[PDB]
Amino acid sequence: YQVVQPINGDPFIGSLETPVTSSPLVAWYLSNLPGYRTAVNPLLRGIEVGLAHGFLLVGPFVKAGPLRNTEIAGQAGSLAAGGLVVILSICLTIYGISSFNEGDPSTAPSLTLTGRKKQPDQLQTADGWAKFTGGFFFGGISGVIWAFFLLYVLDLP
Amino acid sequence: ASYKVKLVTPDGTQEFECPSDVYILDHAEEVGIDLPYSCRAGSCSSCAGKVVGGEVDQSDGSFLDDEQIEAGFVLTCVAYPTSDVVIETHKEEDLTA
Amino acid sequence: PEVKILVDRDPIKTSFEQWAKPGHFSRTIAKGPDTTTWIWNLHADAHDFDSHTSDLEEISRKVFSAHFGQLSIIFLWLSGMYFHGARFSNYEAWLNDPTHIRPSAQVVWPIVGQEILNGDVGGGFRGIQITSGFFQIWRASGITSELQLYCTAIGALVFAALMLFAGWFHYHKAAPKLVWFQDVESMLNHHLAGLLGLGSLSWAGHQVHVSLPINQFLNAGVDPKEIPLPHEFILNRDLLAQLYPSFAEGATPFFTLNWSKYADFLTFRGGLDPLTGGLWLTDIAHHHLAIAILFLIAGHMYRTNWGIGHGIKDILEAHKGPFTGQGHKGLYEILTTSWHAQLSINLAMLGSLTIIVAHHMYAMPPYPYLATDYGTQLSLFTHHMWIGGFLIVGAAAHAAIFMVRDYDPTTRYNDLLDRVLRHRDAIISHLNWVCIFLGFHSFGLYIHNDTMSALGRPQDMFSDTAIQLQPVFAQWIQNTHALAPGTTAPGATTSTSLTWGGGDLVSVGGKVALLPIPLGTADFLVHHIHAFTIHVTVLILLKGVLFARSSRLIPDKANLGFRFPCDGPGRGGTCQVSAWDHVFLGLFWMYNAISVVIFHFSWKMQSDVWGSINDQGVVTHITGGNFAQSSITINGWLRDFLWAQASQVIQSYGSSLSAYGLFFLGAHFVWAFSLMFLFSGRGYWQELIESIVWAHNKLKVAPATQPRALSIVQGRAVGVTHYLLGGIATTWAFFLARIIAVG
Amino acid sequence: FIGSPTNLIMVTSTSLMLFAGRFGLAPSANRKATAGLKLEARDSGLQTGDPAGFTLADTLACGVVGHIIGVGVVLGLKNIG
Amino acid sequence: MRDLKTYLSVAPVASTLWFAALAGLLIEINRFFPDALTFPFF
Amino acid sequence: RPLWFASKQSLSYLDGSLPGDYGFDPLGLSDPEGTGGFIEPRWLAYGEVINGRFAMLGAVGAIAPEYLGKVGLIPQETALAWFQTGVIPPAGTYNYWADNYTLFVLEMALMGFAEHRRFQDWAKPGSMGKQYFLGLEKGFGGSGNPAYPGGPFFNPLGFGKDEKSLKELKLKEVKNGRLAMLAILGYFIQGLVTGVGPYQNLLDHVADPVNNNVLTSLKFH
Ligand code: CLA
Ligand code: CLA
Ligand code: CLA
Ligand SMILES: CC1=C[C@H](O)CC(C)(C)[C@H]1/C=C/C(C)=C/C=C/C(C)=C/C=C/C=C(C)/C=C/C=C(C)/C=C/C1=C(C)C[C@H](O)CC1(C)C
Ligand code: SF4
Ligand code: FES
Numbered sequence A: 001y002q003v004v005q006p007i008n009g010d011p012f013i014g015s016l017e018t019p020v021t022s023s024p025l026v027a028w029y030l031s032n033l034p035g036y037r038t039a040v041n042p043l044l045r046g047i048e049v050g051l052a053h054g055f056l057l058v059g060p061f062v063k064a065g066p067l068r069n070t071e072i073a074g075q076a077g078s079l080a081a082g083g084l085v086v087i088l089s090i091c092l093t094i095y096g097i098s099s100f101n102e103g104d105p106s107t108a109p110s111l112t113l114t115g116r117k118k119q120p121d122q123l124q125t126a127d128g129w130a131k132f133t134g135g136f137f138f139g140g141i142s143g144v145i146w147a148f149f150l151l152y153v154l155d156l157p
Numbered sequence B: 001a002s003y004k005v006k007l008v009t010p011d012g013t014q015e016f017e018c019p020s021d022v023y024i025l026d027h028a029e030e031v032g033i034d035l036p037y038s039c040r041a042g043s044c045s046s047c048a049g050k051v052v053g054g055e056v057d058q059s060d061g062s063f064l065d066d067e068q069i070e071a072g073f074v075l076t077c078v079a080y081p082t083s084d085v086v087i088e089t090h091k092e093e094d095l096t097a
Numbered sequence C: 001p002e003v004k005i006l007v008d009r010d011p012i013k014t015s016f017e018q019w020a021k022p023g024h025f026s027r028t029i030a031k032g033p034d035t036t037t038w039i040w041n042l043h044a045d046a047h048d049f050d051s052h053t054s055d056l057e058e059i060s061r062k063v064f065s066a067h068f069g070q071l072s073i074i075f076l077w078l079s080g081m082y083f084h085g086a087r088f089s090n091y092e093a094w095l096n097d098p099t100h101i102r103p104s105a106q107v108v109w110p111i112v113g114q115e116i117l118n119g120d121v122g123g124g125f126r127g128i129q130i131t132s133g134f135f136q137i138w139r140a141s142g143i144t145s146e147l148q149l150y151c152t153a154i155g156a157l158v159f160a161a162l163m164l165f166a167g168w169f170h171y172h173k174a175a176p177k178l179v180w181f182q183d184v185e186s187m188l189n190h191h192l193a194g195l196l197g198l199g200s201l202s203w204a205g206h207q208v209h210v211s212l213p214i215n216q217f218l219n220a221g222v223d224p225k226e227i228p229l230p231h232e233f234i235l236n237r238d239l240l241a242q243l244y245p246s247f248a249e250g251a252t253p254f255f256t257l258n259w260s261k262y263a264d265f266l267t268f269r270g271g272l273d274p275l276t277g278g279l280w281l282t283d284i285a286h287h288h289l290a291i292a293i294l295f296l297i298a299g300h301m302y303r304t305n306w307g308i309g310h311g312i313k314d315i316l317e318a319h320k321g322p323f324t325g326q327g328h329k330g331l332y333e334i335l336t337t338s339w340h341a342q343l344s345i346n347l348a349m350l351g352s353l354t355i356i357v358a359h360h361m362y363a364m365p366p367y368p369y370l371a372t373d374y375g376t377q378l379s380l381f382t383h384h385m386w387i388g389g390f391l392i393v394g395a396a397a398h399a400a401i402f403m404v405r406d407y408d409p410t411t412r413y414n415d416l417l418d419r420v421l422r423h424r425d426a427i428i429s430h431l432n433w434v435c436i437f438l439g440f441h442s443f444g445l446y447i448h449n450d451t452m453s454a455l456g457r458p459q460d461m462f463s464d465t466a467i468q469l470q471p472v473f474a475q476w477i478q479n480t481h482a483l484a485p486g487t488t489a490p491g492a493t494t495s496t497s498l499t500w501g502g503g504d505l506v507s508v509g510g511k512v513a514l515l516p517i518p519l520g521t522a523d524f525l526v527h528h529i530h531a532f533t534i535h536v537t538v539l540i541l542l543k544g545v546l547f548a549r550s551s552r553l554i555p556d557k558a559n560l561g562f563r564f565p566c567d568g569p570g571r572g573g574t575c576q577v578s579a580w581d582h583v584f585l586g587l588f589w590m591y592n593a594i595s596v597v598i599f600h601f602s603w604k605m606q607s608d609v610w611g612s613i614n615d616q617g618v619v620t621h622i623t624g625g626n627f628a629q630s631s632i633t634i635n636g637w638l639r640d641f642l643w644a645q646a647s648q649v650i651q652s653y654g655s656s657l658s659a660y661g662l663f664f665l666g667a668h669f670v671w672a673f674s675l676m677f678l679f680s681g682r683g684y685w686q687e688l689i690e691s692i693v694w695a696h697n698k699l700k701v702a703p704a705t706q707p708r709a710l711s712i713v714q715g716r717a718v719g720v721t722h723y724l725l726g727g728i729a730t731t732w733a734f735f736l737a738r739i740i741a742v743g
Numbered sequence D: 001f002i003g004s005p006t007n008l009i010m011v012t013s014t015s016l017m018l019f020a021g022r023f024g025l026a027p028s029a030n031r032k033a034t035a036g037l038k039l040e041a042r043d044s045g046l047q048t049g050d051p052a053g054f055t056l057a058d059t060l061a062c063g064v065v066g067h068i069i070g071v072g073v074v075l076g077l078k079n080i081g
Numbered sequence E: 001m002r003d004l005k006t007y008l009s010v011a012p013v014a015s016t017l018w019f020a021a022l023a024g025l026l027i028e029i030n031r032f033f034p035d036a037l038t039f040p041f042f
Numbered sequence F: 001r002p003l004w005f006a007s008k009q010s011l012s013y014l015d016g017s018l019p020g021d022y023g024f025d026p027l028g029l030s031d032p033e034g035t036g037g038f039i040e041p042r043w044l045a046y047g048e049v050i051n052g053r054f055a056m057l058g059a060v061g062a063i064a065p066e067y068l069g070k071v072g073l074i075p076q077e078t079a080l081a082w083f084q085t086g087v088i089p090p091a092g093t094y095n096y097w098a099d100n101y102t103l104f105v106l107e108m109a110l111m112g113f114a115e116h117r118r119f120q121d122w123a124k125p126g127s128m129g130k131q132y133f134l135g136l137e138k139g140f141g142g143s144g145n146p147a148y149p150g151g152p153f154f155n156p157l158g159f160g161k162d163e164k165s166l167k168e169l170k171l172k173e174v175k176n177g178r179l180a181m182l183a184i185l186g187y188f189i190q191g192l193v194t195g196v197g198p199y200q201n202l203l204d205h206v207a208d209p210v211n212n213n214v215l216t217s218l219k220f221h
């Protein structure tokens, strides 16, 4: 018995299968994430994305920036995370602008892991990428807002 | 010195005399038994051949396998005939394999 | 099957005819020169044995006798050291007062005013102060007169002639055959139990009978001439029993198993000798006894001729699992047919060992009066770090040579090698990533610190005063090493070293031998810099080894050899794809890493370890202790280390340290001279040589061996050689002048 | 030295290891242990005279092992009680 | 012995000997006439 | 043919033509496979012969004085051990008619004259009975076999003019030589460990066995 096998029995594709890339727990997990929910509206997935990442990007700008000890300005450093959200969503927008055109199908793969046809993932559109952009951005700014809302003392403010 | 040379050839087998300080090719050029050459510089395999007896000086020979000089093949145009030799001509491809 | 001696008689005949025909070994060189390139090739391929021929027997015979030649050379160098200690030295006066006389075993002739280099080293003597630490070894050996040094010089000369004769003999008269060399089990059994076991047993013997009593007498205060000769201690034993009562029972315990009764001179103390600043000799003798026992037992593992033992093939074949397929099956066939695989493993291990030796010898000083001799300590640490780095890089060179010339899955297939070859892409990807991440988070902190210190924002720095990064695990481990003696080591009294802690400080002659070394934010930063440099060097060398045969860019690279310039300017340009070029690039990065290591050690020791102590007990360090607060920015390294400590070497003109001032500048020159070879290419040079040759032809003075420009690979090699020489020699002069001047 | 002290301990130790090595129950010159579970057979070529194929090499090996093991447990017991 | 005479005339050995002799000559000259900045004779 | 610790490797080449051939070679030194310098088996047999001969001589000589130190008018100043006659000056020396260094040079000169010629017989068998040597050449012809040269000199009495003769005598010779070699090794390590002399040691053991061997492991000096 051996644990590593070529990807789907094809030993001439440039990859392998491991307990890291093809494992039931990892497969199910990575499947149930927004980026891998193919049959779902781009905007909902983007919403999840922006929520989680604004909330996460709150902490570091607060606890490490130049005014970390000045607290007449320490907590309101969420301005910075809002600005970072704005900047990388501008970047999302220009990436989608350059990578796609509406009058062209979505470049995603049409086959699945076993050899059945799928309806190409629409996130790789121009339309749906702009939709996902709006979703991520909405979520990012309001997630910044949410994690700034919880200023109540917990364990480490 | 000027040992006698023997060359099997599709034309037959002929002998010519020629000093040891010379290359075989110009010496078959002297008496006039035509042989195939391209380079005259020891950097191709048109003048290739193998030996029946004796052995030929291959000091100034190059572009050869680290074996082509230990199992028979020789380039006629950069070769000094140290002995009364007996050699082959038109031997490029069974050398080319 | 069985093990025996196997030899041929008179394989090659002693003659001079091959000396007069240069390049006899290679058919291409033998033909003779047309151009000057010949002369270079003649030297570059001189010791490439497995390229002169195809036969493994011949390569092994050549290797064996070449090893004998190297040993003869080493013996001659030892003979010189002992003769110079005996004849042109102040060793006896230093033996009389070690903490005032600075050692010196080289004098110069008065030829052009150079006698100024014969400086006042104390003791009625004028010469060059040496830093190899030989006086400390000779004192730890028991040597007390120059007659013993003469005797050892003569013995070493004899041994050198013997080695040279054996080198001639095993190549020309009695040359062993391949089956003799290819017996690795008997070889390992002999080197483990015979060379290392019997060696350290014999040495433990010498320490028990000579070094221990003579050093006891010397530390008691006795005049080094009124001490008995060593052999007296062997003839009359009451002399020994006066210093160690246990020598009265005399081997009755060793049999009665009451080894306790030897606790006289076989101890387990730990810590330093507070009289000489070195390890207890009664600890070193006991150590060597234990090591000899361990090795003598370990040299009885492998089966040779009597059934009992272990077959290496069996051990390797037994190990395999579900992640590695069949692994270790097929490594015995490989490790017995290629010299390059063996050389790579051996070089890797010996380089790592040398680095470990550097650390352990600074931290637990073995010789007496070495810890307070600061120049010798600096010299030894630095020397051994450089040697270790070089050997580790050679390991990569010969792994690459094995991959290009010897690896062959058609006749010698191993699974593990094949699997690593089959995921090299992921390997190199992850290593690349971790080096980038490690470089951002260590050097980046320095850049942040410099910018915060220049912007008048020191409260935003990464330091002990503003934002602390304490190495908790290192502090935790040395705290565990402090509490060890008595809790997890009930048999020890003091702990292994004084750097662990416990508040114990050792002084000698008003100087500091050792004390606890403090770890802080600066130590954290420096260590992550070190991890960064080692990871980068590894990336370069391992990329060179793993892709030595083929790539996505050049799919038949193994057919171009191990050392080739390129595969042309196409495909975008393919300069330096060979594995030789990867070794060439890794040498620069090894230089970088080792240089930073020796700078970190040199500044840290002066700042928090070395110095002078007062009778009241207030330690004044050589530098003021400024490593904790100035090492955290780059400006502090440029200002407080380089600029401030180069003063000694830029002010030595007119003194006896002026040779260091001359070598400083010469080394800068050689370094800058290499950049010309590194930054240019040979096309320009050959075209310039064209016109110079014209000028010579104009006067019927042109040479017949046509001058050429150097090879592409030779250009790279000359460049890296002069770069390394220049840089290392600059640091050599700086260190030696600085450390000798202050003390 | 001989009496009832170290003598008893070391003698019984080396004696039991020799008794093991002669018979089975232990790797030996004519016995190759596979992985610590069982033993195979092998004629080492070295001729002996003992009916059980007990070589001098075997005797030396098991004697050294008896001495190592006896020295170990002697020093232990006399260092703890 | 003839082969030795040839070998001794190979380039590195010949240059080694030539320069060692030259070095001895200049060394002895400077040991006899030290610190010369000019031609003090004529 | 009794065998001692023989093996299928040693018992291959040890057929039996040699005296005292017991098939004992647990290290395989006589194996003729890969033979070179000073490992050739003929030289090893010759070396055993010469070692044993010199050992008989030296082992009887190193004990003779201190035995005649006890019986007769033999003066005790000329009754020393074998280690306190000058062999190890840090252990006792004497004042002969020469220096002990002039003695070394002169003894080396005489033994050079002897041993160079014995070797030259080994190397080119039959060389020495050809060049002039003031006479003294008619007797140094040889017998084809190095270790048994014969002649008018090395065999005056004419022992063993047949084959059984020579084989039986050769066996006894090599066996006694081995015994004396063992004895000399014992001399060395006894005279170190107890440090008194082999005859005195024997006479100190014949009385009581209380201090036979393990007693002296205290190694006084
Ligand atoms: C050349 C122009 C420039 C300017 C004007 C600034 C200005 C500033 N830098 Mg900056 N920097 C620059 C170049 C510049 N930087 C470059 C080239 C580098 C690379 C070396 C850096 C790297 C750098 C670092 C690492 C940091 C700064 C920080 C800061 C802020 C410190 C003062 C402060 O605390 O403000 C007040 C505190 C605030 C949080 C103000 C936030 C600004 C608004 C609210 C963000 C809104 C963004 C908006 C939605 C859209 C973004 C831009 C848009 C107009 C396109 C300040 C506003 C520090 C900082 O504060 O991090 C944010 C800090 O961490 N800079
Ligand atoms: C107890 C046995 C013994 C000992 C002590 C050694 C010792 C050594 N071997 Mg060796 N070897 C042995 C058995 C032994 N070997 C066996 C059984 C085999 C296979 C059959 C080999 C095959 C082998 C190879 C292929 C090589 C060595 C090498 C070396 C040297 C390693 C470098 C070094 O550390 O130098 C340390 C230096 C010293 C300790 C200085 C003292 C030197 C003493 C006198 C060495 C004498 C030991 C030697 C076995 C004497 C036998 C010669 C005798 C017949 C006259 C070293 C001196 C390397 C070598 O030959 O370098 C020349 C090497 O290439 N050995
Ligand atoms: C046990 C150590 C060891 C051994 C036995 C070998 C053996 C060998 N190596 Mg190797 N190597 C080693 C260590 C070792 N190496 C280390 C530590 C490195 C890292 C630097 C390398 C890197 C290396 C490379 C890159 C190559 C080899 C190659 C070779 C082969 C040919 C070497 C040769 O003859 O070139 C000839 C030797 C010279 C021309 C001498 C060079 C002189 C140097 C450059 C000057 C040094 C300056 C000096 C120290 C001080 C200045 C003095 C001056 C001012 C007067 C040979 C089998 C070559 C090969 O092709 O393998 C098949 C190859 O190219 N090695
Ligand atoms: C068989 C084998 C094989 C296997 O395989 C392995 C093994 C086991 C190893 C082996 C071996 C074994 C052994 C035992 C060996 C040994 C030998 C010997 C002992 C010799 C001696 C040998 C010996 C010898 C020569 C000796 C000699 C001696 C002499 C002369 C003496 C002299 C002297 C005298 C008189 C006296 C004086 O006063 C001194 C002197 C001067 C000193
Ligand atoms: S010749 Fe030089 S520049 Fe051109 S491809 Fe090769 S290495 Fe590069
Ligand atoms: S013509 Fe091609 S080799 Fe002479």
Ligand SMILES: [Ca+2]
Binding pocket: C004, C005, C006, F028, F029, F030, F031, F032, F033, F034, F035, F039
């Ligand atoms: Ca042999």
